[PDB]
Amino acid sequence: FNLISEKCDILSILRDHPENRIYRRKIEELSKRFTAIRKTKGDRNCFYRALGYSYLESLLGKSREIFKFKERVLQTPNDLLAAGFEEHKFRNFFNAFYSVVELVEKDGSVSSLLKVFNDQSASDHIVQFLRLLTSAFIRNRADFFRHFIDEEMDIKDFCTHEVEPMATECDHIQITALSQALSIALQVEYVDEMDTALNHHVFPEAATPSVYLLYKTSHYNILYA
Numbered sequence: 001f002n003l004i005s006e007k008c009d010i011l012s013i014l015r016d017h018p019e020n021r022i023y024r025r026k027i028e029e030l031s032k033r034f035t036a037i038r039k040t041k042g043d044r045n046c047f048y049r050a051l052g053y054s055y056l057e058s059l060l061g062k063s064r065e066i067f068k069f070k071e072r073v074l075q076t077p078n079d080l081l082a083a084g085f086e087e088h089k090f091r092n093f094f095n096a097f098y099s100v101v102e103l104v105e106k107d108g109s110v111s112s113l114l115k116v117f118n119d120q121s122a123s124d125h126i127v128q129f130l131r132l133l134t135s136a137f138i139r140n141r142a143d144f145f146r147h148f149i150d151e152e153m154d155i156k157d158f159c160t161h162e163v164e165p166m167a168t169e170c171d172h173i174q175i176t177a178l179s180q181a182l183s184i185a186l187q188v189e190y191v192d193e194m195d196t197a198l199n200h201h202v203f204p205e206a207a208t209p210s211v212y213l214l215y216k217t218s219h220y221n222i223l224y225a
């Protein structure tokens with residue numbers, strides 16, 4: 001369990017910020033709304049790894065939602081081709097993502113899914129797939145991202161440098177794009193060391209979340225309500 005941990009009680013993360021007034025206050029408040037947490041390795045891939053695991057976990061045993069998700073995943077090679085990715089270069093990553101979706105369907109256990117996400121090779125193939133899909137989705141909708149995010153940004157250069165490469169960290173744009181690309185509704189909780197309210201953002205704005213993540217000291221950890 002070196003990439004995604006076993007489930008722990010929410011208050012177990014007090015030991016990560018010992019004798020810290022503001023972190024202690026915010027973690028106590030968080031414990032009033034959430035029961036449990038999984039920690040992820042801080043290797044620069046933890047947003048993609050956390051969202052991929054938490055969303056597939058939320059599908060286990062749900063036969064309609066699995067069918068619909070599989071239907072969407074089968075179309076994603078068209079998104080990649082439209083953005084100029086070549087099939088022989090994305091094949092290995094697509095195949096690994098499709099395989100873990102079939103595992104959710106066929107096997108249906110938390111244990112089996114957690115083993116795939118802690119297998120360095122399978123887990124990193126999954127993350128690289130999610131990164132290419134994020135890049136395709138932004139590139140195919142460049143005017144949308146320029147209109148609503150930043151009219152001055154260079155979309156192609158941003159995708160080449162800050163989305164595609166392993167270990168590149170995320171901002172709002174990558175989170176919005178991957179949420180939209182896979183139709184995942186997610187809520188991010190923010191815990192920083194400023195004397196401010198514990199607060200959250202939902203992607204997209206009006207939705208009921210499938211997935212809750214905690215963003216703290218640059219990691220995304222997985223929360224359970």
Ligand SMILES: *CC(=O)NCc1ccc(Cl)s1
Nearest residue numbers: 042043044045046047218
């Ligand atoms: C999400 C993720 O992998 N974060 C990487 C980190 C950078 C600084 C940290 Cl401390 S963790």
